[PDB]
């Protein structure tokens, strides 16, 4: 198989968009399961959001090709033509042209079988008073959440970008929130369903206080976009790739962010009423797997929502329902 010339990403020779375009029948005929769906809201003239920055992490070369999540983008076709020049090098990628709101499209996409649905907007972020600005994303979230499926609904995993933070109150029900809460304390953010650009603002200050920390966050979130790749893209030739030498291809042993379950497998013994430190010491020692937090149901006593716990104490209790955020080499 073939890679970007710096080894860091899976790669394909160039494509006309019509190789990746699908109608509803073609999308429905395709066996899309455990995939990523991108619901893209755009007008044909609206600014390029750089969806490469979305696809490229999901094509890190330290995944094997058989475990690369298939990707389908639902959105405005004329917009996608002017995005396409940046996307065309990535494998297992497809487009269904149309509105994300038209349920049909969502059913033809097997939205109920995806591993994550992303809701994202290229619309103007200042076009009205803030209560209207996110209406497209909010309606899309509620729409998907309200669907039903044959042998569901709110069990569809979602992440939605918000242009205005305070709109997060509309994004969910069974919420028990107060509008006095700042975004980072809100249930939808604590569950990983919301995201908003305001949480990036301290990247300016952290940039200054420790430059290396800003490199670390980039090396994780980008999947490995080194400055050599940025230079190769800045030559304007497009993302040059092909087969690789073993000398560069060695970098496919990068560390990866992964998530694992205490419900079964060799760690489940700790999920049965052990503590996070017992799990941590064991998993690092036997697998080199380094644990950085937990993902736990809010309703342990009910909904599939789960909250995130960064760096638990050593004596912090575990449940067999817990999932662990980890750093791994395989």
């Amino acid at each position: 198989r073939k890679f970007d010339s710096t080894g860091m990403f899976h790669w394909c020779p160039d494509r006309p968009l019509n190789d990746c375009l699908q109608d509803r029948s073609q999308a429905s005929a395709s066996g899309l399961r455990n995939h990523v769906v991108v619901c893209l809201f755009a007008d044909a003239a609206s600014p390029l959001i750089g969806l490469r920055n979305l696809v490229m992490p999901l094509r890190a070369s330290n995944f094997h090709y058989h475990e690369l999540k298939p990707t389908i983008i639902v959105g405005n076709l004329d917009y996608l033509h002017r995005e396409w020049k940046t996307l065309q090098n990535f494998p297992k990628l497809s487009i269904l042209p149309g509105s994300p709101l038209n349920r049909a499209n969502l059913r033809a996409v097997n939205i109920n079988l995806c591993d994550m649905c992303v809701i994202v907007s290229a619309k103007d972020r200042n076009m009205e008073d803030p209560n209207l600005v996110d209406k497209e994303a909010i309606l899309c979230s509620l729409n998907i959440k309200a669907m039903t499926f044959d042998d569901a609904g709110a069990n569809v995993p979602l992440i939605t970008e918000l242009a205005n933070d305070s709109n997060v109150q509309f994004l969910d029900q069974d919420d028990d929130d107060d509008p006095d809460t700042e975004l980072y304390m809100t249930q939808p953010f604590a569950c990983g369903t919301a995201f908003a650009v305001s949480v990036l603002d301290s990247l300016m200050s952290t940039s200054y206080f420790n430059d290396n920390a800003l490199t670390l966050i980039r090396t994780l979130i980008t999947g490995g976009a080194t400055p050599e790749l940025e230079q190769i893209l800045a030559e304007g030739a497009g993302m040059r790739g092909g087969y690789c030498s073993p000398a560069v291809l060695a970098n496919r042993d990068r560390c990866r962010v992964a998530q694992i379950s205490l419900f079964d497998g060799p760690l489940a013994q700790f999920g049965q009423g052990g503590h996070y430190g017992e799990l941590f010491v064991y998993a690092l020692r036997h697998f080199g797997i380094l644990c950085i937090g937990l993902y736990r149901f809010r309703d342990t006593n009910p909904s599939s929502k789960r909250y995130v716990i960064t760096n638990p104490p050593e004596d912090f209790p575990l449940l067999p329902t817990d999932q662990v955020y980890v750093l791994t080499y395989k």
Binding site: L132, I138, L139
Partner: protein
């Protein structure tokens, strides 16, 4: 879009509020039908003025003046003659003096067919019954002889006031059956 937001905000704050929303476009309605706690069986509704407008004028293509007939039934309007009005104006305005009203049928209507109930309403009570609530439960318009009236049936009437339709609630098949001065009908001894 702005009005959808609102309904989202209202329902998000409390799901069980009866919300009635005006829509200027029909195609927007489908969005609010997808709101997680929107429930027309609970009494939520959308007054789509575009859908209604085109329905009213489309019925006029089936029966030429029907949009005027029907629009007058759905606005409060007092009959108020003045002597300069022609015959046709005094007639027309008496027609505008109608609204549609809803009331429970008295037990005297029980086990009639809808045809006899309409005959009785028109002839004795001076009320135009045109539809009934049939036990889930559903509205039915001018239903055929097979439909019996049943106890506590809600009826749908054309009349000059709510005060008129009351007669259908008080009527008694012993106590009022010959009260030709219809305004005298009240709580029966029988």
């Amino acid at each position: 879009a702005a009005n959808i937001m609102r309904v989202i905000s209202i329902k998000n704050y409390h799901s069980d509020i009866k919300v009635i929303v005006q829509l200027l476009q029909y195609h927007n309605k489908a969005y609010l039908l997808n709101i997680p706690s929107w429930d027309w069986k609970r009494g939520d509704d959308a007054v789509c003025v575009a859908e209604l407008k085109l329905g009213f004028i489309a019925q006029s293509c089936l029966a030429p003046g029907f949009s005027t007939l029907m629009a007058n039934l759905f606005t409060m309007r007092s009959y108020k003659p003045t002597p300069e009005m022609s015959q046709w104006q005094t007639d027309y305005m008496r027609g505008t003096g109608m609204e549609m009203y809803t009331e429970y049928l008295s037990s005297a209507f029980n086990a009639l067919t809808f045809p006899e109930a309409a005959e009785l309403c028109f002839s004795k009570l001076k009320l135009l019954l045109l539809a009934i609530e049939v036990r889930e439960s559903t509205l039915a318009i001018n239903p055929g002889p097979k439909v019996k009236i049943e106890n506590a049936t809600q009826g749908f009437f054309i009349a000059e006031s709510a005060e008129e339709v009351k007669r259908a609630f008080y009527y008694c098949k012993n106590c009022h059956a010959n009260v030709s001065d219809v305004r005298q009908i009240k709580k029966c001894k029988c």
